[PDB]
Design a protein around this nucleic acid. Structure first.
Lengths: 83, 825, 219, 43, 141
RNA sequence: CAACGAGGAAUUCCUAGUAAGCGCAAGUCAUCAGCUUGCGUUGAUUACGUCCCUGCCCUUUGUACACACC
């Protein structure tokens, strides 16, 4: 049907010296008109995943794990916190 | 959020509009800003303030200035008020129930006159855009729009249904035939503008820019083009300014007529027009010395038929007037002046002498106003209110009744404050003077002459009130104590520059002073220590405010933005740009970090000090908001402005081819219906006249567009385009081709629209029969055969008739050129 | 600037592009090829089945098409694209790595089909200028300056991120939205003749197995 | 011969061959013709 | 304006000529010509073409300039031809030639009249399909 | 005393050596063998019109030189 550009101009005419309304409206139209960072399946009788956010957290997790192992790698001491 | 709203507005009695008078002297309807208030001249109490049912500041109030009322007008007998506003709308109210009956937007700019006509049911309206519209009240409809003036309607005069006559802000007076709504006769009245119009039936009177008042004779039953309205002579006035309202009366009990010309400044020139007996018995006296010269003298009439009268003056500049009369010794004239005040004068006249060297006002309603803009507003704990003016009119209004109960005379006073026990007012004036007043006793406790060398600009009490600070344009601030109830100057801090705002903290801690040199300085009161210098505002800087915790200050200026400063280190937080003219004042709430700022562009604005949003954008004033004051506890805020207003704020689709086909079918159906009607008429006129057909009523769309069917088909045949014309003619079948031939056969009898559409008729007809030639020559009907012969004869006669003069003009023009050549090549 | 086998018809003439699949394509590759033919304008799609590549190349370069995009898959997921410029010009062949397509995700409407704007981010080397020229002479020369679709070829360490966006320009900035397929393509081979032969001289191809392979970009 | 512009600045001659005079034409048609030649002077 | 409303085309014509209001002049000439085709030596009404017959040199040179740039249409050309014809048959031809400026106008509008003569003559030429269709319709029996 | 006899709602692609059937080879610095790319064999039905619907685009001085149309 109608274009994403036409719907985007309609969404901007919809949303229209306050700041937080513009922060909210801009974040809303960005996460609405960005469809390639969700994943949608087809219901055989729909947003089923958030690929980039899941990827970002899965790789930041192992990034801090890798830096922790690189910090541990040639240590021999350690504080023993019994508190 | 617990938002704000407007509780009540007051302080205005007469605003930028006219006034209508109602008989019982009598009462008076006049304008406050955007709402109309009725007053009884006898006592002067505000008996009605007819206002819009929606409070300005509510949820559905729209984001602009409210429409200022600009013309009052009243229907007396059927009891209506037609009022008109500055956007162009006209609200008609019944004065019994005070609701809005009629809304009549219509115009595009502010409106300048109303008039009821034929006393009820018709209202004519002239506006600052040059249209003048007639409205019916039984149909709620703009009937007619008289549209030929060029600048702005300054006056008109109508009689019912036939003649209107208007004059506008160009030099032009116009007379309008209201049957055809075309302008009939136009003159240039005055060489600049034309501001006045009045007429008692024979003579018409107009005035323009400067003192030249022109008498005209309108002869309504004239027949010549120029001469329905002729000019009969000019005269002079005493005012060299714009006379801008003229109005007539016929006093009874002999019969006599009086008219006034109000002026721009301060003065109404009244005139008695005389009667025909003294016209006849005064003609000979200037016809003395006995005739070409005497005829020139008799032609050069105004001073003859018009007689000046008692020139009524006033204290202030005059905005509007209207009168009443009895006995010719009670010319009783109400007058609304610009500095808000109405005045009821009355001149007597013993029918030969006006019995006074100068007329006398019998009433004056001026108590609920100020005569100037309120340069400083203040409030009590919660009960009373303080308004400070330039004439001297300090006034102590009260919140719970909106009435000034106490008023004094100070001078050009720009700042004031209360005293912390109540019932006591400190004030500073624009010269080197300070003054003290109270509430129970009379005006002056004491004044201090030479309180400062130059203009004082801002003072502030301490929170206990015993010690106040005055900063003035003599580049000094001074401190004063209260000794026992008198003022004790003890110390004075001279700066390098003109201090123009002071403030202390609400806990006796800081003294923040705003200099003319684009900065503020924060001092310690206990040391004169020079704590901080806040800098970077980039124009001279107006009102400061310190928060309740004494941590956060605001800083307003003429840079159209307010800056938030943290007072612990003097570090800026925001620099938020409000208010596109100039923020005059800015004030916190009592207990919160929310604040208000009123500005020089007719708007107050509600902000928070944490997210720095704009909480609300309040839009009730009309002009420069000079001051605002917040309640000490609770937090309702008053704001007072340049439009003499003081207001409270509290909490809450076919195509070508088928278009031509349906046009052809209805057109030829009408055509042969009328031809059958004509055959019926000839048979019932050639036979026994006992019967005939009843009536073919003409077609709905044909009488709706006012066209003969040949013209209707001709313009839709025009309105198809040349690219799809050969398709529009190819789509239609042969029955529509036959009725197209009937259409062409009828249209080349009306030889007017044959000759104006010859190549179109030729192109369409020749394509039609060229495309349908195989079927056309197989039709067997002598009616169509005679039809084709008739179309052929008339069409070829028209075409040879136009190429005859084409060939004539070719040979004649080349003869002209050739005889010029053989003359002088 | 425009190099020696594109300079004859740089901005004189609009291009003409064929988009075609590998051989007996899967349905997601056919959807992908439709997305590529309405990614860039004056491109049409041709159903490759039982087409030989020499007479396909010969029929294209005597019909007058400027260039050819051949798409290769792996079980739906497209893996390669070869761009062959026909007047005895170059073939740049790329692998495609992170492909997300709008036919997979969302009926978000229809596309825009305007002559787009083009962004090229840090193609600094001469091989970068070469691949910029071969990627942008399959677009229409001289769009309107208020055209509201842009596409982007951004180099991110020899992985050209390829996206398409539409935009309006609002009061405080510019608001973007993502249309069409996102990629990271990477050039594994250039050569200087057409697609028919593989006897053409190679201008560049990546050396995967040298021991100084991962030290530099556009190696 | 062809229809050029007007020879004085009190009238205009359109390419059509019809002409208006500045004073004679109505202000609605003056706005319309100003807008029209603005577009014709914009393309 | 009053004359143009109420009818009365002769004094309307001379006021439009005095004020030099060219669109109003085209309208008064077109309206008077159309009503001249309606009713019934004389081509306008007699009062108006006498009013054309009694105008002086600079008035008829601006009238023929108006006729010049009306003749460039194929639509507004008939009004121009009727006005040119009444000027030609009501004025003196030696006067019309020796008026200064009346050759840069008539040389401008000889070829446009020749163009229109060719077009209307071809319209008369292709107007004989009606005559051919009539001879077929009479051969039908 | 489990599934299943050509697969619902919806949805995607497709115009001549094309859709589809069929096998045989290769495995070419990226990708691929849970497959990928070649190669031949057999080979159609239906559009090839239209802007009516859905959209996308272009223009709204004719300019470019006649004739013609506007």
């Amino acid at each position: 049907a109608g274009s994403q550009l036409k719907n985007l101009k309609a969404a901007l005419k919809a949303r229209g010296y306050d700041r937080e309304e513009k922060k909210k409206a801009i974040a809303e139209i960005r996460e609405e008109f960005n469809p390639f960072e969700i994943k949608a399946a087809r219901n055989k009788r729909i947003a089923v995943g958030k690929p980039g956010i899941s990827k970002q957290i899965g790789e930041e997790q192992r990034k801090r794990a890798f830096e922790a192992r690189k910090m541990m790698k040639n240590k021999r001491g350690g504080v023993i916190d019994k508190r | 959020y617990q938002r704000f709203e407007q509780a009540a507005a007051f302080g205005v009695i007469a605003s930028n509009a006219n006034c209508v008078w109602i008989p019982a002297p009598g009462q008076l309807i006049t304008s406050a800003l955007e709402d109309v208030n009725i007053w009884d001249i006898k006592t002067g109490d505000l008996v009605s303030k007819l206002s819009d049912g929606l409070p300005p500041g509510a949820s559905d109030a729209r984001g602009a200035k409210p429409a200022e009322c600009t013309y009052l007008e009243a229907h007396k007998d059927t009891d209506l008020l037609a009022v008109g506003y500055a956007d162009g709308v006209i609200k008609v109210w019944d004065l019994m129930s005070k609701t809005v009956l009629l809304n009549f937007n219509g115009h595009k700019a502010a409106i300048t006159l109303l008039q009821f006509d034929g006393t009820g049911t018709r209202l004519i309206s002239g506006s600052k855009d040059s249209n003048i519209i007639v409205w019916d009240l039984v149909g709620e409809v703009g009937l007619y729009k008289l549209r030929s003036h060029k600048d702005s309607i300054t006056g008109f005069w109508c009689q019912g249904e036939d003649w209107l006559i208007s004059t506008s802000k160009d030099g032009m007076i116009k007379l309008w035939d209201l049957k055809t709504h075309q302008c009939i006769e136009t003159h240039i009245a005055h060489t600049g503008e034309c501001w006045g119009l009045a007429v008692k039936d024979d003579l018409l009177i107009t005035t323009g820019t400067d003192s030249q008042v022109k008498i005209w004779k309108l002869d309504i039953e004239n027949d010549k083009m120029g001469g329905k309205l002729t000019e009969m002579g000019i005269f002079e006035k005493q005012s060299k300014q714009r006379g801008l309202k003229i109005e007539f009366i016929t006093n009874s009990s002999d019969k006599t007529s009086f008219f006034y010309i109000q002026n721009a400044d301060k003065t109404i020139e009244t005139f008695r027009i005389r009667k025909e007996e003294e016209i006849a018995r005064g003609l000979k006296k200037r016809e003395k010395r006995l005739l070409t010269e005497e005829e020139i003298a008799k032609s050069i009439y105004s001073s003859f038929i018009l007689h000046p009268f008692q020139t009524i003056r006033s204290l202030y500049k005059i905005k509007s007037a209207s009168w009443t009369t009895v006995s010719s010794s009670k010319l009783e004239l109400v007058l609304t002046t610009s500095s808000n005040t109405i005045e009821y004068y009355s001149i007597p006249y013993e029918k030969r002498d006006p019995t006074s060297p100068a007329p006398l006002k019998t009433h004056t309603i001026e108590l609920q106003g100020q005569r100037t803009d309120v340069r400083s507003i203040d409030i009590s704990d919660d009960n009373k209110l303080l308004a400070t003016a330039s004439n001297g009119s300090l006034k102590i209004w009260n919140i719970k009744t909106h009435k000034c109960i106490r008023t004094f005379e100070c001078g050009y006073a720009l700042t004031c404050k209360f005293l912390p026990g109540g019932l006591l007012v400190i004030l500073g004036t624009r010269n080197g003077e300070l003054q003290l007043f109270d509430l129970a006793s009379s005006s002056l406790l004491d004044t201090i002459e030479d309180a400062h060398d130059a203009a004082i600009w801002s003072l502030d009490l301490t929170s206990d009130g015993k010690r106040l600070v005055t900063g003035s344009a003599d580049k000094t601030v001074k401190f004063w104590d209260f000794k026992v109830l008198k003022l004790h100057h003890d110390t004075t801090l001279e700066l390098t520059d003109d201090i123009l705002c002071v403030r202390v903290s609400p806990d006796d801690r800081y003294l923040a002073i705003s200099l003319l040199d684009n900065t503020v300085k924060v001092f310690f009161l206990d040391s004169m220590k020079f704590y901080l210098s806040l800098y970077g505002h980039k124009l001279p800087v107006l009102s400061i405010d310190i928060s309740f915790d004494s941590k956060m200050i605001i800083t307003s200026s003429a840079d159209k933005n307010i800056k938030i400063w943290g007072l612990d280190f003097g570090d800026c937080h925001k620099s938020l740009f409000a208010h596109q003219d100039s923020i005059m004042n800015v004030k916190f709430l009592p207990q919160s970090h929310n604040f208000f700022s009123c500005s020089k562009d007719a708007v107050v604005k509600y902000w928070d000090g944490e997210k720095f949003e704009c909480i609300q954008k309040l839009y009730a004033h009309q002009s420069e908001v000079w001051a605002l004051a917040v309640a000490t506890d609770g937090g309702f805020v008053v704001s007072s402005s340049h439009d003499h207003s003081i207001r409270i704020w509290e909490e809450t689709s076919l195509k070508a081819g088928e278009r031509l086909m349906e046009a052809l079918d209805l057109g030829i159906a009408e055509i042969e219906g009328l031809e059958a009607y004509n055959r019926d008429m000839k048979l019932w006129q050639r036979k026994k006249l006992g019967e005939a057909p009843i009536k073919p009523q003409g077609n709905a769309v044909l009488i709706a567009v006012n066209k003969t069917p040949e013209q209707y088909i001709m313009d839709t045949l025009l309105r198809i385009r040349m690219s799809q014309l050969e398709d529009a003619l190819m789509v239609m079948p042969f029955s529509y081709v036959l009725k197209f031939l009937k259409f062409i056969d009828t249209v080349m009898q009306n030889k007017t629209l044959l000759h104006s559409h010859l190549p179109l008729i030729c192109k369409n007809l020749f394509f039609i029969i060229k495309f349908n030639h195989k079927e056309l020559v197989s039709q067997k009907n002598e009616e169509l055969k005679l039809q084709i012969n008739r179309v052929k004869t008339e069409l070829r006669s028209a075409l040879k008739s136009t190429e005859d003069d084409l060939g004539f003009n070719v040979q004649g023009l080349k003869f002209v050129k050739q005889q010029w050549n053989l003359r002088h090549n | 600037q425009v190099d020696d086998e594109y300079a004859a018809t740089s901005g004189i003439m609009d291009p003409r592009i064929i988009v075609t699949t590998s051989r007996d394509p899967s349905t997601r590759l056919s959807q992908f090829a439709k997305e590529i033919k309405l990614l860039f304008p004056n491109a049409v799609r041709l159903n490759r089945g039982n087409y030989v590549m020499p007479n396909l190349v010969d029929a294209c370069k005597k019909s007058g098409t400027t260039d050819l995009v051949v798409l290769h898959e792996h079980r739906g997921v497209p893996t390669s694209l070869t761009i062959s410029h026909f007047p005895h010009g170059p073939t740049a062949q790329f692998s495609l790595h992170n492909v997300v397509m709008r036919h997979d995700i969302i009926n978000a409407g229809n596309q825009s089909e305007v002559n787009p704007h083009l962004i090229f981010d840090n193609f600094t080397t001469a091989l970068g200028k070469r691949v910029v020229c071969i990627l942008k002479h399959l677009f229409n020369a001289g769009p309107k300056k208020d055209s509201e679709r842009v596409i982007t070829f951004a180099n991110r360490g020899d992985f050209i991120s390829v996206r398409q966006h539409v935009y309006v320009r609002t009061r405080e900035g510019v608001e973007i939205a993502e249309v069409g397929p996102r990629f990271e393509m990477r050039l594994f081979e250039l050569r200087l003749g057409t697609l028919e032969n593989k006897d053409a001289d190679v201008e560049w191809q990546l050396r995967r197995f040298i021991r100084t392979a991962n030290k530099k970009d556009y190696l | 011969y062809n229809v050029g512009k007007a020879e004085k600045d009190g009238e205009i001659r359109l390419k059509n061959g019809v002409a208006m005079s500045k004073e004679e034409l109505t202000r609605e048609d003056k706005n319309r013709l100003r807008r029209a030649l603005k577009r014709k002077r914009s393309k | 304006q009053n004359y143009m409303s109420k009818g009365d085309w002769t004094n309307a014509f001379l006021l439009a000529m005095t004020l030099d209001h060219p669109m109003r002049l085209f309208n008064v000439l077109k309206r008077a010509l159309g009503e001249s085709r309606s009713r019934q030596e004389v081509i306008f009404n007699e009062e108006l073409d006498q009013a054309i017959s009694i105008l002086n040199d600079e008035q008829l040179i601006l009238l023929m300039k108006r006729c010049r740039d009306w003749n460039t249409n194929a639509k507004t050309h008939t009004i121009a031809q009727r006005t040119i014809r009444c000027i030609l048959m009501h004025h003196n031809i030696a006067k019309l030639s020796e008026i200064p400026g009346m050759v840069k106008i008539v040389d401008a509008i000889i070829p446009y009249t020749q163009r229109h003569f060719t077009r209307v003559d071809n319209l008369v030429e292709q107007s004989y399909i009606l005559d051919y269709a009539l001879v077929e319709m009479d051969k039908l029996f």
